[model samples]
Target: TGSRHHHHHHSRKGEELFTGVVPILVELDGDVNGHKFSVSGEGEGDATYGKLTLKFICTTGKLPVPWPTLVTTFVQCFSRYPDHMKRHDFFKSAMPEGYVQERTISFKDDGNYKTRAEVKFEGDTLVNRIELKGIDFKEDGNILGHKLEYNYNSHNVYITADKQKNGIKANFKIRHNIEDGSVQLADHYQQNTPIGDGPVLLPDNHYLSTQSALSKDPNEKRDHMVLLEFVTAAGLVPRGTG
Candidate 1:
């Protein structure tokens, strides 16, 4: 029912993506709230059966707008591809046989920071990467964006079977990084502070909140003495229909 070609232009006035950007101001707490926040980028697309659906995610939070608005914002963001053919050509190689291309999503944990999902294909093997970055929220969120890219490089394979046959496997590396602007908290910090430590912390109560933050020295100006730590997690996408 939401297909683009089926809709009329005159009736689709407020369906653009950025139109929902205004709602972020209404949804999230203002900067004066003392609590700092980071925003990330999310580009997601899905291929089910044969149809490929692509979509994007806004980095602002807490959301001040409805989910439809958010989806619209995401859709508009991808509309810049000139045309469907251009879009198809842009990501054609990324599509796997017997599957359709999906959307890409970028997410913001707070303000300028962001995380992204990306993929690339080489011959019969496919490689995908999820990267995260840290940026200055005080500065413009748009500028110097390339500085915040953390790639979780994973190598995958194509599905060769139907249900219990064969699928893709990913190779990952897990480690602790402090110099990479990865943030972490202290030994007792998690128990003391209600909010988890670090710049790219995973919100509690989430099955995927496996990352932590770096801590700081007690007497150091709280800025220079403070440090950031990050945990690298590894996982794979299980292929095959059950």
Candidate 2:
């Protein structure tokens, strides 16, 4: 908010709600130019069947939360897009008219801040840029760090991709928690190595290769396991089945 008096206030009592579960809200807002039609309108050659892709790349350090928790929380939220209105009936009383349209945020387990959500849209371009901001921390029923409330935060364009083709890209950071006694400090964090720049292609990045015990299982060795899981979960491009 660019308001001179746009003050943010929430009771300190709310932070207690997210003890084990940190909350994240993906706020979706965009301007859809060149395509003018409601979700109820008709179709043409380019009418209606196109898709939207949201890329949640970590442009910097890892969020102050665990990565798996981040991925899992998102998968759970987006799955509710089809029947959003009925399932999210509470908002009907607060913001009556735009109740269903504004975005929706949900939590995994029932803590206090698990279900905070916000949604918005624009009508202009066929190619739309959306901002998917995940609300992390909560304090007294409100998210603590929001750029729109604090100051100018990072500007990212959420380009909707073909769910069947261009899968979303996920870039995150990882710092070493412990060190092998023999390994030097410079080699401690793998500071020079590049974190992958594409969708997480394998589950084993965190599980088998690094953290989990599977690293010792020679048969389990393979690259890009996390990214592959993403492809499988996000849906796959059809291939010729025999």
Candidate 3:
């Protein structure tokens, strides 16, 4: 996956692959307002965790050729940690249909960790299930395992995982925001501090909020429901090259 290319070829067939979807510039910001971690068994001391806030802006185009898609140039602004931000520059294209595949890698403390996630969909366009696995190269261990179920019509997401070898278990129930209006995280929690400064002090303004749903331009009143749904099906993007 780290292989470098000397050049890339863009053919007429490639250009024709995207004909119906419109291109637009989008901006977004998000905050992990609440986060937690815990460890059982022989683990002691408070399970340390960090919250993240992000800002992104990019030019994206929609395509109908490869199953309704949204393609974009990935951009970055700010993040609370190195791992929280995309590790490499890349392009993102998402489709909200059929089966989707995702893979990601992160470098932290001189160690590399990778994750693979797959999400499947039903004939009715509802997500059937999601599976994910993680590998830690330095520790020579699998650090993650996950299974999630979704109820799209009901706008709900359910997740469960048993005690991974790392002595961790977690379950989460999340609801989709279905309100008719735009939603924003308008508060700036971290003020004038360097990004990713850790030992993680709470309420230290580590999280910055935006009134515009993500990076919505103030000049325009719009909602990103379409983009959100596209990304949901596309799987979260990992750092990589275009």
Number of the predicted model whose lDDT against the real structure is largest? 1
Candidate 1 residue-wise lDDT, 200-222, digit = tens: 11111101112222233455331
Q: Write the residue-wise lDDT of candidate 3 on 1-242 in tens digits.
A: 11122122121221121222322222221111111111111101110111112222221322101110111111111111223222211111111222222223222321221222222222312121212222332232111110111112212111111112101111212121223332211111111111221111111011112111122335533221221221111112344222
Q: After superposition, how far is residue 71 of candidate 3 from its true place, in Å?
A: 14
Relative to the unseen true structure, what is the C-alpha lDDT of residue 89 in candidate 3, on a scale of 0 to 100?
10
TM-score of 1: 0.19
Q: What are the candidates' C-alpha RMSDs?
A: 19.4, 22.4, 21.3
> Which digits, one per residue and each the tens of the lDDT, describe model 2 over residues 97-153?
111111222322211112222221122111112233334334222122111111111
Total clashes in model 3, counting residue pairs 3 or more apart in sequence or in different chains: 8
Instruction: For residue 45, give model 1's deviation from the true position in Å.
Output: 6.1
What's the count of clashing pairs in each model shown?
40, 29, 8
Off by over 4 Å in 2: 1-52, 72-115, 124-242
